[PDB]
Design a protein around this ligand. Structure first.
Ligand SMILES: [Cl-]
Ligand SMILES: [Cl-]
Ligand SMILES: [Cl-]
Ligand SMILES: [Cl-]
Lengths: 114, 114
């Protein structure tokens, strides 16, 4: 019931398939990265959309208190927005065990740690 | 009188001095990067501050129409805010002639093109 928790469980399998995979990095185009990450939380009834460099979240069921706790700007329990970079940092938190995460408006780059 | 124009004129000299400079990359900690970039526009009376993952701009003199044109959310001609990533992309536009620009909450990395 915390939608951000769904990221600790979803593999980087998503990002592997969608990205360009090298020995020591994976590069994922931004729209494909965001599409995959948005789809993860769609199962708790949380809808996500990008407009500009902001991510907008809204939910019919689940409260978004976890997103607010992590920095999102919410108008109520069911509607929040947050910068693209904050969204990327949140959803890749578990991937940081194995990868440096960096990005720009074009793409997300995960570099194997070492 | 367009404050974003001041970036086309300010060298990467700033970033070299503040960063860790290697043969094919420069890595600049975020607070030092933003401090240098904020200082650039301070000369047209534009004040800049980071809070969360947002950059807040306000000006006593110069209008901020150029920032608005580039995506900033403005309450009037003299007050705007924009996501950190959008700010980074804007201020490094001229550096993109020589460098890939990428970043995260920790630091900005410029990789020599080639
Ligand atoms: Cl954990
Ligand atoms: Cl857009
Ligand atoms: Cl130009
Ligand atoms: Cl802060």
């Amino acid at each position: 019931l915390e939608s951000t928790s769904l990221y600790k469980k979803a593999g980087s399998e998503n990002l592997y398939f969608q990205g360009i995979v090298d020995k020591n990095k994976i590069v994922i185009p931004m729209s494909e990265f965001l599409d995959s990450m948005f789809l993860v939380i769609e199962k708790l009834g949380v809808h996500a959309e990008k407009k500009g460099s902001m991510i907008f979240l809204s939910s019919e069921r689940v409260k978004l208190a976890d997103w607010k706790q992590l920095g999102a700007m919410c108008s109520d329990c069911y509607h929040c927005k947050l910068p693209l970079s904050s969204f990327i940092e949140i959803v890749t938190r578990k991937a940081k065990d194995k990868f440096l995460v960096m990005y720009n408006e074009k793409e997300v780059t995960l570099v194997a740690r070492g």
